[PDB]
XYZ file of N, CA, C and O in Angstrom:
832
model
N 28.845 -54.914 46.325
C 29.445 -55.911 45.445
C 29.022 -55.679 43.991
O 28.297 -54.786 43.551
N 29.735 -56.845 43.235
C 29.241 -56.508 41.369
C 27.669 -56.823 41.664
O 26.945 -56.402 40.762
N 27.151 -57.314 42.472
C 25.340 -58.078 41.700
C 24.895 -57.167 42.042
O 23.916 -57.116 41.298
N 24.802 -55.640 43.137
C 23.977 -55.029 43.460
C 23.876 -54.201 43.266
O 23.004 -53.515 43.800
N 25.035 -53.573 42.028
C 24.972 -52.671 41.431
C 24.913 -53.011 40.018
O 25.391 -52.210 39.215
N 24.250 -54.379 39.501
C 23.615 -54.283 38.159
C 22.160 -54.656 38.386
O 21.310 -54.572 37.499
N 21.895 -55.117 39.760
C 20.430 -55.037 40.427
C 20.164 -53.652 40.588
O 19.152 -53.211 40.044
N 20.784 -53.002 41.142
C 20.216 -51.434 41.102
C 20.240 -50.502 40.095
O 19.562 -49.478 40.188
N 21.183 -50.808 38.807
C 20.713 -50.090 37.487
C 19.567 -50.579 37.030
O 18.598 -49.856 36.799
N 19.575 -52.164 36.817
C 18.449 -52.317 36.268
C 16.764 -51.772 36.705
O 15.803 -51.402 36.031
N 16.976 -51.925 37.977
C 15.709 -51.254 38.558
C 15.347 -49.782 38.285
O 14.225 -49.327 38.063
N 16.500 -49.144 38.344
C 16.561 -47.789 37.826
C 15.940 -47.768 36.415
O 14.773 -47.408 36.259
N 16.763 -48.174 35.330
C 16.196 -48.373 34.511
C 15.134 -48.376 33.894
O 14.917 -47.548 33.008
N 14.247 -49.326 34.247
C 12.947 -50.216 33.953
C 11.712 -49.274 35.065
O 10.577 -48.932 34.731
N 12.195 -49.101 36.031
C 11.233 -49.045 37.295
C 11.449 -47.703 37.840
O 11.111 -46.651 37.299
N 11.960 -47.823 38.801
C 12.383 -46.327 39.612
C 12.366 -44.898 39.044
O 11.606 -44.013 39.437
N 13.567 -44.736 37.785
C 14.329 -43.837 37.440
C 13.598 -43.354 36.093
O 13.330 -42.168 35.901
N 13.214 -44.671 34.913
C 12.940 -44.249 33.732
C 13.858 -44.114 32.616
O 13.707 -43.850 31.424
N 15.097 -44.436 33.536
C 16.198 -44.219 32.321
C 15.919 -44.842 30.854
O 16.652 -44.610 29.892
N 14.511 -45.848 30.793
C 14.727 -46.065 29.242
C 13.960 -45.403 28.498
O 13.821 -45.599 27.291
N 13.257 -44.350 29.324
C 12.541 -43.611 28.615
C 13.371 -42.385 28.304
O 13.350 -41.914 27.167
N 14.326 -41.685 29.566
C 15.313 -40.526 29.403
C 16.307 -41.696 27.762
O 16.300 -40.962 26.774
N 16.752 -42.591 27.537
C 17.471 -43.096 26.369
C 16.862 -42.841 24.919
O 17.363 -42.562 23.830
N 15.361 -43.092 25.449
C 14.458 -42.825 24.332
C 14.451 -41.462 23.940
O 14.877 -41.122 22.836
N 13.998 -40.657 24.769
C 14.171 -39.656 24.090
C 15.050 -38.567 23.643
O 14.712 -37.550 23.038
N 16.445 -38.985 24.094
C 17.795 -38.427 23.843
C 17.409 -39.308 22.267
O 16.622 -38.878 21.423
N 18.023 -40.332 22.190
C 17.815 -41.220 21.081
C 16.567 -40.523 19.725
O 16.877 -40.352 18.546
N 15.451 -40.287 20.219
C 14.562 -39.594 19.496
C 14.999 -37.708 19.153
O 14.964 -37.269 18.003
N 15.193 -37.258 19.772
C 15.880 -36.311 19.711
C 17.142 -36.141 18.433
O 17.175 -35.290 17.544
N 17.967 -37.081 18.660
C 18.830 -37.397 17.774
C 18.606 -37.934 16.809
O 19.464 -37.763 15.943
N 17.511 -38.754 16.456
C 17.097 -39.415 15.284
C 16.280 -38.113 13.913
O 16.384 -38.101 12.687
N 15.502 -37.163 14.898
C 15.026 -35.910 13.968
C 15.910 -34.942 13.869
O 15.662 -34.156 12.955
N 17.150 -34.652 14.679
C 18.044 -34.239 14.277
C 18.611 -34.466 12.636
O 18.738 -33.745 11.646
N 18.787 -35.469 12.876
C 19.101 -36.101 11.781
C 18.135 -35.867 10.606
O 18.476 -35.398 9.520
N 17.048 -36.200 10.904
C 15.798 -36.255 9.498
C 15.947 -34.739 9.313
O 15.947 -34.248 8.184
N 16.065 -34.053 10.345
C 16.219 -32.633 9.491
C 17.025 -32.107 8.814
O 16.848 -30.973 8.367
N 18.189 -32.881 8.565
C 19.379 -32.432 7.884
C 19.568 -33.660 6.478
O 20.446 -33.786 5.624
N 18.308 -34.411 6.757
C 17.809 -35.345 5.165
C 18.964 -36.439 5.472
O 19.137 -37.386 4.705
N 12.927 -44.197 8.214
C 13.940 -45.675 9.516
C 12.804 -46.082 10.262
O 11.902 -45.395 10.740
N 13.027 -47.553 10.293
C 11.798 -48.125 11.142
C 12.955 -48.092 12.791
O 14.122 -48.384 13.053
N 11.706 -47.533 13.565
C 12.254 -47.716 15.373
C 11.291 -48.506 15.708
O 10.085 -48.467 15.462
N 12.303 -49.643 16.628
C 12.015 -50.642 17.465
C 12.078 -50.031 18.704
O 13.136 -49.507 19.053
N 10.646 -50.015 19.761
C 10.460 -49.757 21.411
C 9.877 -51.080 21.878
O 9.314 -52.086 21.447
N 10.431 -50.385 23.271
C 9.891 -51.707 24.279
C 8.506 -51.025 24.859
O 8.306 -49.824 25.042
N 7.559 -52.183 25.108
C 5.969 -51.944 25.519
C 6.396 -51.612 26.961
O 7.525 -51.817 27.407
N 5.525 -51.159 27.532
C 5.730 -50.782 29.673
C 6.606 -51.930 29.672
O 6.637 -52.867 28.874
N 7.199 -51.745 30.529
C 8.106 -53.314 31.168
C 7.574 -54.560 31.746
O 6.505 -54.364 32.323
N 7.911 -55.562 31.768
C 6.704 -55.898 32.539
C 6.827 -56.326 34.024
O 7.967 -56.317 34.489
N 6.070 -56.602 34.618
C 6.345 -56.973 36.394
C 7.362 -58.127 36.790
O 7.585 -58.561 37.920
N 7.975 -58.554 35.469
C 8.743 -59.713 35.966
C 10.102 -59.596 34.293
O 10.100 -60.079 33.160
N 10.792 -58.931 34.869
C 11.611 -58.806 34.050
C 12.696 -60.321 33.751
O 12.800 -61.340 34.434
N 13.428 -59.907 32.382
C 13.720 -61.818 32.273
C 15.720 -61.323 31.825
O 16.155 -60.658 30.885
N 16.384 -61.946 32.865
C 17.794 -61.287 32.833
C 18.682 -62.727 32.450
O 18.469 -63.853 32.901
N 19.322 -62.473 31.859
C 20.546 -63.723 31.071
C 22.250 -62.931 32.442
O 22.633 -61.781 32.656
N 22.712 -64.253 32.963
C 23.931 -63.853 33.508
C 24.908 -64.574 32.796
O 25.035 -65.772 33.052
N 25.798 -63.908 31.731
C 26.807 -65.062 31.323
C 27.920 -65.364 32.067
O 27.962 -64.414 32.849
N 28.884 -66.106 32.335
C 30.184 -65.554 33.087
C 30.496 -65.781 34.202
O 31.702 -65.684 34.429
N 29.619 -66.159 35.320
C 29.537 -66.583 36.729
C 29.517 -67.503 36.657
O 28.780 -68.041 35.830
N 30.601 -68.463 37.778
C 30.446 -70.125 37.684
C 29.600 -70.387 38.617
O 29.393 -71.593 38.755
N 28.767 -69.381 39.635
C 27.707 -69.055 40.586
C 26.873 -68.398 39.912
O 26.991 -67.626 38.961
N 25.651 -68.935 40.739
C 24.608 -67.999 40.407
C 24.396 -67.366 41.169
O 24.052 -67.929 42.209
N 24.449 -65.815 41.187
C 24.061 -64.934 42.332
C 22.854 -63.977 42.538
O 22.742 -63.341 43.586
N 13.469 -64.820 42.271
C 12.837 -63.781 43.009
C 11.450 -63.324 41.947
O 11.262 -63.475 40.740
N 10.665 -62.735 43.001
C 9.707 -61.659 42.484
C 10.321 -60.827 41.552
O 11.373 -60.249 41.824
N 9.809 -60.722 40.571
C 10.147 -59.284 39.399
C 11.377 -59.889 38.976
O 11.942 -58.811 39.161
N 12.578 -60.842 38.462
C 13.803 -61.279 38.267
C 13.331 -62.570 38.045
O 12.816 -63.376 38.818
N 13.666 -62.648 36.530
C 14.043 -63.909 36.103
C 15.132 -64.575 35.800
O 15.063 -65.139 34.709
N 15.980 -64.692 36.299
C 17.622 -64.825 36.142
C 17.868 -66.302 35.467
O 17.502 -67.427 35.808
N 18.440 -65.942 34.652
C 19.277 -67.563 34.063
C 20.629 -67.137 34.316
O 20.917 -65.940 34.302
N 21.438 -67.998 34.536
C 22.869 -68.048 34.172
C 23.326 -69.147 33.808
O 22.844 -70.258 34.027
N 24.782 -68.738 32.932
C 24.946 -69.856 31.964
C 26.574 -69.302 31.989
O 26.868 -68.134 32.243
N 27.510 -70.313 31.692
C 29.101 -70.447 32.199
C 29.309 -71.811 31.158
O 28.677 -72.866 31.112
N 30.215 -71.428 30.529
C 31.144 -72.519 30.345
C 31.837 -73.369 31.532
O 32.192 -74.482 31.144
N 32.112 -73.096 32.895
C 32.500 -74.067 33.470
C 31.709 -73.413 35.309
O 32.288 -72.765 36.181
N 30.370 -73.899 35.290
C 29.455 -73.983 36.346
C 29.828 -74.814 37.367
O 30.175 -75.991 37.468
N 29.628 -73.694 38.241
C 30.771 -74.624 39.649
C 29.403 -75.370 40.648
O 29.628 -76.145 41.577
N 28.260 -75.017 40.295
C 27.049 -75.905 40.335
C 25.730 -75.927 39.568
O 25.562 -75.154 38.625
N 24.852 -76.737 39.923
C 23.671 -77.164 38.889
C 22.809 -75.891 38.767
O 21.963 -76.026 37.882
N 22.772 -74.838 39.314
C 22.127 -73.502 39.126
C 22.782 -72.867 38.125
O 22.450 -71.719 37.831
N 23.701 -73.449 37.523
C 24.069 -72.538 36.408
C 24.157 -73.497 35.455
O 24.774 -74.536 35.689
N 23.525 -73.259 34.213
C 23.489 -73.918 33.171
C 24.641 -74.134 32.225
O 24.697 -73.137 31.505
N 25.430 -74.853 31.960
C 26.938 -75.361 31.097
C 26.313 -74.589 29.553
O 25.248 -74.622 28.937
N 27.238 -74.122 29.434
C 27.132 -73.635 27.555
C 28.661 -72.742 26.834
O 29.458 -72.046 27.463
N 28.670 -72.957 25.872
C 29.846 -71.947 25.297
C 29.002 -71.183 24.652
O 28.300 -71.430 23.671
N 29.158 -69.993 25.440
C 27.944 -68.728 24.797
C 28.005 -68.434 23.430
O 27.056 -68.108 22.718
N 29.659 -68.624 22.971
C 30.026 -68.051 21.441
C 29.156 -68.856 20.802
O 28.528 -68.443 19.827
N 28.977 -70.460 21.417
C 28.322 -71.793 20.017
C 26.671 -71.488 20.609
O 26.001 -71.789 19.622
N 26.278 -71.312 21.048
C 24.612 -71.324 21.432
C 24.200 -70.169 20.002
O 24.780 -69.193 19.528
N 22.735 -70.988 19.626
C 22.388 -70.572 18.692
C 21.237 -69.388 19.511
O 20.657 -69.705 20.549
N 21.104 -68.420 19.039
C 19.951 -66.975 19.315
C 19.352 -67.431 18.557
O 19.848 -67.731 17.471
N 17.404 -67.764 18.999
C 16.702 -68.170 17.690
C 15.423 -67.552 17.914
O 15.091 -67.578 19.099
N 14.820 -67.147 17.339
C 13.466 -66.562 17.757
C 12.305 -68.005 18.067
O 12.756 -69.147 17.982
N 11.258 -67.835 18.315
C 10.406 -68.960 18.871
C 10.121 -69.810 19.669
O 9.328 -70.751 19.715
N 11.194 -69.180 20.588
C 10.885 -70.213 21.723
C 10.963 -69.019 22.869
O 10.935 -67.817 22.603
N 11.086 -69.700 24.460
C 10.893 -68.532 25.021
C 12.098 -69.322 26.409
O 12.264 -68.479 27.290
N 12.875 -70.645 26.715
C 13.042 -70.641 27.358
C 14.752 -71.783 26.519
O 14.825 -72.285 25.397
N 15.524 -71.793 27.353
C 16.575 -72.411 26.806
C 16.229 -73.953 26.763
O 15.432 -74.663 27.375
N 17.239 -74.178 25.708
C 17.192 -75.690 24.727
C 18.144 -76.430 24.934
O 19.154 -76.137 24.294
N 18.230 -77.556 25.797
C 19.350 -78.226 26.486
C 19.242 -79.602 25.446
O 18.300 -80.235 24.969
N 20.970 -79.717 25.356
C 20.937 -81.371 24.529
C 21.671 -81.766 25.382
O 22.264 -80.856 25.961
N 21.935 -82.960 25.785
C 22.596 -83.569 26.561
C 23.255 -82.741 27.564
O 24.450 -83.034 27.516
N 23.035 -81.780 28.516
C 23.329 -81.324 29.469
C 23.737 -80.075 29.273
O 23.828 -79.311 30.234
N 24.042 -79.676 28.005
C 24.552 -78.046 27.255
C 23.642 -77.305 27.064
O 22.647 -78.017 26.935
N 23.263 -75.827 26.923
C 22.601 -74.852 26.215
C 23.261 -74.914 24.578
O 24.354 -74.502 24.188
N 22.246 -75.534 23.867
C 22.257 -75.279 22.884
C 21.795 -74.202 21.870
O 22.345 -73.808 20.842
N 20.346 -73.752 22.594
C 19.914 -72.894 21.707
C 19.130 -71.578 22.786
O 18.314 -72.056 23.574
N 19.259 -70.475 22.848
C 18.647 -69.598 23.477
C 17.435 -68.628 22.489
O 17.429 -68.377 21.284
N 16.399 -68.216 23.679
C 15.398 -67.166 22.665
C 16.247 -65.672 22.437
O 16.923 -65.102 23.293
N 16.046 -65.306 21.287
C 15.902 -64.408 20.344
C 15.038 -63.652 21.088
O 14.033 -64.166 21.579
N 15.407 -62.051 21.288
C 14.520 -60.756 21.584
C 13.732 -61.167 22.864
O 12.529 -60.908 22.867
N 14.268 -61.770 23.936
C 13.504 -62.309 25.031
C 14.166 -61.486 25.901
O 13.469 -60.510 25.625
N 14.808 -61.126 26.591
C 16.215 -60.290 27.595
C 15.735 -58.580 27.391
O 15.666 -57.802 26.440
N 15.439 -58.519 28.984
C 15.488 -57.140 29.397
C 16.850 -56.723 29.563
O 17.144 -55.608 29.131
N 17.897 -57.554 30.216
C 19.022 -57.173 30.668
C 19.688 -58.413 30.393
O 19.062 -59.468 30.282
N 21.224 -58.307 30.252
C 22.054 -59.167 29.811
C 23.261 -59.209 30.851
O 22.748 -58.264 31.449
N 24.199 -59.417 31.461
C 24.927 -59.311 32.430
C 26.029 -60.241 31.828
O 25.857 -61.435 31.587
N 27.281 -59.483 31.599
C 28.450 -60.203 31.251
C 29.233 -60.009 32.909
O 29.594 -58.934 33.386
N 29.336 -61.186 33.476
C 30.203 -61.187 34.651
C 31.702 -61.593 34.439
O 32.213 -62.637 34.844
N 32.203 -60.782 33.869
C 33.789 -60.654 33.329
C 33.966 -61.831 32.199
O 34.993 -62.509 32.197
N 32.824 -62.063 31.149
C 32.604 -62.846 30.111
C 34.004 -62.345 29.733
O 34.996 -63.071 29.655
N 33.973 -60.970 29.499
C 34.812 -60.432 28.456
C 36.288 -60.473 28.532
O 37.125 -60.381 27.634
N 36.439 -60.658 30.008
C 38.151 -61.125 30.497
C 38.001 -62.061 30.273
O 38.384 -62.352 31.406
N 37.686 -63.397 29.670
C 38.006 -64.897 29.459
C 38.472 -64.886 27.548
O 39.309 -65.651 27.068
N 37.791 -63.978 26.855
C 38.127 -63.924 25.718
C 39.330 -63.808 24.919
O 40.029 -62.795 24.945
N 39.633 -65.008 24.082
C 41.386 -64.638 23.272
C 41.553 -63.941 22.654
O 42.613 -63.952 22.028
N 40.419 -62.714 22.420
C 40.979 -61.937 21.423
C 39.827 -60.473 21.028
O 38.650 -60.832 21.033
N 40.011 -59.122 20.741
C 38.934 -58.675 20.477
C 38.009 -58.924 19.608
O 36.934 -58.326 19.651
N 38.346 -60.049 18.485
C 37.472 -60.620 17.419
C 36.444 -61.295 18.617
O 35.242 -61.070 18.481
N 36.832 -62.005 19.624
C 35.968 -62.987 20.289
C 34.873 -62.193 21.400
O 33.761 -62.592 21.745
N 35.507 -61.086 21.775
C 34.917 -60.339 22.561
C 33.420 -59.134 21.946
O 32.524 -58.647 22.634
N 33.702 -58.968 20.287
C 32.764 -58.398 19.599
C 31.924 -59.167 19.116
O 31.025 -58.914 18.314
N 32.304 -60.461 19.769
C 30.964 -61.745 18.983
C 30.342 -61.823 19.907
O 29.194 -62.179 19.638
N 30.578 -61.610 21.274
C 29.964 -61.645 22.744
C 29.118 -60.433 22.196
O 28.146 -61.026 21.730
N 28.975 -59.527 22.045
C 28.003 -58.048 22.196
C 27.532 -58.607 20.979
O 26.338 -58.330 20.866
N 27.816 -59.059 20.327
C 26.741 -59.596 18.658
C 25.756 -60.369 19.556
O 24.606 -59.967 19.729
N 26.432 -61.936 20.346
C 24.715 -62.325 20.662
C 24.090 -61.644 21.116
O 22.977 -61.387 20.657
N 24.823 -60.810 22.747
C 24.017 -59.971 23.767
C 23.102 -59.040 22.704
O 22.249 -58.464 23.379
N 23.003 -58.763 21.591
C 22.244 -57.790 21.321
C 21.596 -58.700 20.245
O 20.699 -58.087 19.666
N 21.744 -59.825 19.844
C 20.408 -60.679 19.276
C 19.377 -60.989 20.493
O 18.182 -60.709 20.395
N 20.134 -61.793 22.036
C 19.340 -61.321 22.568
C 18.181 -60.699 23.434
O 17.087 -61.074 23.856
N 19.036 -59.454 23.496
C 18.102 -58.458 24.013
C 16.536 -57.733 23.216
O 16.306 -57.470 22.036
N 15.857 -57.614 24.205
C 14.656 -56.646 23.409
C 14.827 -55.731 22.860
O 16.048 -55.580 22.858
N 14.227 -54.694 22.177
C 14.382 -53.456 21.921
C 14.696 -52.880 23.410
O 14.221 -53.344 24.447
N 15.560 -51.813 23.315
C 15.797 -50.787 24.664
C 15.716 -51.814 25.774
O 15.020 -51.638 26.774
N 16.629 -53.150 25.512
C 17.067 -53.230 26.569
C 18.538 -53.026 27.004
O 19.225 -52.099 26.573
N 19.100 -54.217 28.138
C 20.403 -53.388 28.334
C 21.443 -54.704 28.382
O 21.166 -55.879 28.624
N 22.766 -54.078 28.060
C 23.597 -55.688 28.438
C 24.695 -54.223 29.740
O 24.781 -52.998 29.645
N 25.198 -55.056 30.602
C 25.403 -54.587 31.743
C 27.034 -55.387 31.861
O 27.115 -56.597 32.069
N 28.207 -54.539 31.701
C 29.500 -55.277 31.633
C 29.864 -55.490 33.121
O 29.006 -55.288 33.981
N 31.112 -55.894 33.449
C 31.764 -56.384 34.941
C 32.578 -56.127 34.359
O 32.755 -56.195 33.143
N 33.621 -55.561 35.715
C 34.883 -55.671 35.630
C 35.577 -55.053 36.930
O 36.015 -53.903 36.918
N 35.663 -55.993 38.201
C 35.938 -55.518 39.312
C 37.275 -55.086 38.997
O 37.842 -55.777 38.151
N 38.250 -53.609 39.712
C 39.240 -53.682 39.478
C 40.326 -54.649 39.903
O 41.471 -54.521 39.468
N 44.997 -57.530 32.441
C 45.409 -56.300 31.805
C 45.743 -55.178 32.293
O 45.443 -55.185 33.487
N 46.170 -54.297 32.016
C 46.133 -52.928 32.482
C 45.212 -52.308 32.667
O 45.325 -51.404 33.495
N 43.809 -52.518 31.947
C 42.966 -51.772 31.267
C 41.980 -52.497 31.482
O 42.267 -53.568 30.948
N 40.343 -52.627 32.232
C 39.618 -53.455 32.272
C 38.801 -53.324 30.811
O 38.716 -52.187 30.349
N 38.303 -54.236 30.193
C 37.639 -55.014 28.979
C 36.222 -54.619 28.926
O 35.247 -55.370 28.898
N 36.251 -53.120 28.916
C 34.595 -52.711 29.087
C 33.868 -52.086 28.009
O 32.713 -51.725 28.238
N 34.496 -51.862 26.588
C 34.168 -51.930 25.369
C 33.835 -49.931 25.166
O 33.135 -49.102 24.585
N 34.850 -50.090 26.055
C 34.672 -48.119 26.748
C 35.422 -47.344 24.968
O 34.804 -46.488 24.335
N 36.074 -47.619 24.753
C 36.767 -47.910 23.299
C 36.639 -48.350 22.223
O 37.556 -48.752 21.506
N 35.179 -48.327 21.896
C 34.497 -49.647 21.449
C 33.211 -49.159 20.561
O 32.579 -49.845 19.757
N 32.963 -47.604 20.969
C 31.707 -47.227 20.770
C 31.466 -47.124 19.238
O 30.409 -47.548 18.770
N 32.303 -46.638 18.542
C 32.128 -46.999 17.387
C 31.481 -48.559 16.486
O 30.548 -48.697 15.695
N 32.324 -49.389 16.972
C 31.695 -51.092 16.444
C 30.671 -51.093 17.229
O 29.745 -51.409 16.482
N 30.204 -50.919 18.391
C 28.848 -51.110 18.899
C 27.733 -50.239 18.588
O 26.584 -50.517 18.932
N 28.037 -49.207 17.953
C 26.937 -48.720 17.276
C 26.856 -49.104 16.103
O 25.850 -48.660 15.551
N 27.543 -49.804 15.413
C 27.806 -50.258 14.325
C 26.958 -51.764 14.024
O 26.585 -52.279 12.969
N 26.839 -52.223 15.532
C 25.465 -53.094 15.814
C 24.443 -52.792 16.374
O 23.475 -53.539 16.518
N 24.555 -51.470 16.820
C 23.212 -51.208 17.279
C 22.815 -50.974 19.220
O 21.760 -50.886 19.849
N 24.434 -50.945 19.651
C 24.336 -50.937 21.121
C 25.154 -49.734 21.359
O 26.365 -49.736 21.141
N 24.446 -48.595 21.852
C 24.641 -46.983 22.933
C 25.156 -47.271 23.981
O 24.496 -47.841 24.850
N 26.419 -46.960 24.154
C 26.734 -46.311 26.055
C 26.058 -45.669 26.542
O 25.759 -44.607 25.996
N 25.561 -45.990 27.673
C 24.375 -45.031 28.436
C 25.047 -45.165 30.345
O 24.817 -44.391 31.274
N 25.525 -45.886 30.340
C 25.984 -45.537 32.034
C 27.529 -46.107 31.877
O 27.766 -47.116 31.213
N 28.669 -45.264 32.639
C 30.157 -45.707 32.996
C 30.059 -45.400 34.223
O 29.600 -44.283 34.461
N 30.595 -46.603 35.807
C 30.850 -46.312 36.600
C 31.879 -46.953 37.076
O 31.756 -48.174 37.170
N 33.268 -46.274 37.540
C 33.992 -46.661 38.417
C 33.956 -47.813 39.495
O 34.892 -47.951 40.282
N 31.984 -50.883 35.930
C 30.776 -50.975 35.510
C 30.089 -50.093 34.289
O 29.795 -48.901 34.370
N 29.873 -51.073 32.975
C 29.084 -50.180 32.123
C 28.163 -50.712 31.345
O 28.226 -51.938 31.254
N 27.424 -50.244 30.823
C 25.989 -50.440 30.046
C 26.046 -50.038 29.289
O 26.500 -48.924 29.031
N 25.518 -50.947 28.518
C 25.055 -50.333 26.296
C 23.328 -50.759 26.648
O 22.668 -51.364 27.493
N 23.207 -50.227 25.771
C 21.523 -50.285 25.601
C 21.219 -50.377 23.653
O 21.614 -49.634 22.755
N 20.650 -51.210 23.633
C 19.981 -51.226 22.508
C 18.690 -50.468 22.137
O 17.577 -50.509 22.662
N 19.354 -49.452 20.617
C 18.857 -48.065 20.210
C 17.697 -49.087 19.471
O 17.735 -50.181 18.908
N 16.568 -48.009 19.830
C 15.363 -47.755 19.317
C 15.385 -48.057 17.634
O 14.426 -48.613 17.099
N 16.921 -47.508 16.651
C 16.884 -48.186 15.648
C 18.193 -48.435 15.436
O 18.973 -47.742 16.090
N 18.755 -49.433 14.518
C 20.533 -49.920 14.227
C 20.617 -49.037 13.267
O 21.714 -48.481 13.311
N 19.764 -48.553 12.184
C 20.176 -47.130 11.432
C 20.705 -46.216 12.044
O 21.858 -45.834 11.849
N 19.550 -45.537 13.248
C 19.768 -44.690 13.742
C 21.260 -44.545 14.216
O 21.909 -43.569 13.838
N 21.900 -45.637 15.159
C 23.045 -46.444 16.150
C 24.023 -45.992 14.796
O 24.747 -44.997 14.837
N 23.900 -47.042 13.396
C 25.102 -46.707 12.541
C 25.037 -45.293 12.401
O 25.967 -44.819 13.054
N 24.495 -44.569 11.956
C 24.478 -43.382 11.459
C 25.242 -42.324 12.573
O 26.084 -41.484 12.258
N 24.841 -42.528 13.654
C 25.837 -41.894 14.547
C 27.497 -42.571 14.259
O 28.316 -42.002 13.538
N 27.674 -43.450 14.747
C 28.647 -43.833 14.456
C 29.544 -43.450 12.988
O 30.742 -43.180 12.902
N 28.704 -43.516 12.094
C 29.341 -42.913 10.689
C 29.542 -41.411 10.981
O 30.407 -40.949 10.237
N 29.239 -40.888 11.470
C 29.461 -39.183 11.860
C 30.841 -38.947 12.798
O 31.644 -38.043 13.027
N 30.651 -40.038 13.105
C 31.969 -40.034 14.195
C 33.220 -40.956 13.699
O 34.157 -41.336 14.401
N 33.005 -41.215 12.344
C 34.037 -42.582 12.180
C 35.243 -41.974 12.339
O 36.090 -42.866 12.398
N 35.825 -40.726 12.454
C 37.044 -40.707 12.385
C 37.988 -41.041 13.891
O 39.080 -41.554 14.138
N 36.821 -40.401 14.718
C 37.243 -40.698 16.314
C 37.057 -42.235 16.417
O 37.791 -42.655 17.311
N 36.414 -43.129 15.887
C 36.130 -44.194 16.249
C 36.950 -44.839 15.632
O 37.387 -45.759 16.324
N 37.410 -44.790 14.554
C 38.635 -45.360 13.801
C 40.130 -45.332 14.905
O 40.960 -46.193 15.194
N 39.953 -43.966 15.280
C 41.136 -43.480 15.923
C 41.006 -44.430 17.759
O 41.702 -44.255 18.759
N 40.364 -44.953 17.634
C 40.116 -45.334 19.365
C 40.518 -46.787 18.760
O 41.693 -47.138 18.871
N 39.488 -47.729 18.060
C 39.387 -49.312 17.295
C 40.604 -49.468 16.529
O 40.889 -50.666 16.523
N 41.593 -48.667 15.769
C 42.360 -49.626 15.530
C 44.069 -48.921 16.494
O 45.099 -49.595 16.496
């Protein structure tokens, strides 16, 4: 199903595989590339034993090591927290969500190993609304963490596969497409634009 294959990247990821260290150093690689042809980097510390995951998008919520929140504009029960993800404020200083009268009002800033849009992005009116979705997901995520799209099989599923340009343009890398995809937040948003500016012509040519 969709949960057990963004349960099993993430583990990969973080645990098993290392993939955020193989990101890192592709990413590093590419960053002295660069310095050699003429930036502060943001990393993540070891991971830690209890990773902390945001699900937007599920009107369900679907442990040891998993800290799962989920949050839906229309929660089909009390395990999922009511919010319009676009209006919730990303704020640094706190560490756990800020409920006013029964809504998520305010979420932590740089707290999120992993982010999970469960077909957030098919509910959206428009691609303006859908690039404000990857703006919070990457306020927030940690450094090198990951936001993780859905889209069980428009014509065309809404996986931002087309996209790479404006998302490096904030600071979020494609790092896994599966027949399901993942951006990861680069080590630096210089680094992220600067690729992207190398490529603007393909990326122009895909975005508009």
């Amino acid at each position: 199903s969709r949960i057990k294959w963004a349960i099993d990247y993430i583990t990969k990821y973080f645990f098993t595989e290392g993939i955020y260290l193989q990101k890192r150093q592709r990413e590093q690689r590419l960053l002295e590339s660069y310095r050699a042809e003429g930036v502060q980097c943001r990393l993540m510390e070891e991971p830690p034993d209890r990773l902390h995951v945001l699900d937007v998008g599920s009107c369900f919520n679907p442990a040891p090591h998993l800290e799962v929140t989920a949050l839906d504009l229309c929660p089909a029960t009390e395990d999922v927290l009511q919010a319009d993800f676009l209006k919730v404020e990303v704020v640094p200083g706190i560490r756990e969500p800020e409920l006013e009268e029964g809504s998520v009002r305010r979420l932590p800033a740089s707290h999120y190993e992993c982010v999970i849009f469960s077909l957030l992005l098919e509910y959206m009116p428009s691609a303006e609304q859908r690039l404000q979705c990857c703006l919070q997901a990457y306020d927030l995520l940690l450094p090198e963490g990951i936001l993780v799209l859905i889209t069980p099989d428009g014509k065309n599923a809404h996986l931002m596969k087309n996209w790479r340009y404006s998302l490096a343009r904030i600071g979020l890398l494609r790092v896994r497409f599966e027949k399901c995809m993942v951006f990861r937040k680069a080590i630096s948003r210089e680094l992220s634009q600067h690729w992207a500016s190398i490529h603007r012509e393909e990326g122009m040519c895909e975005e508009i």
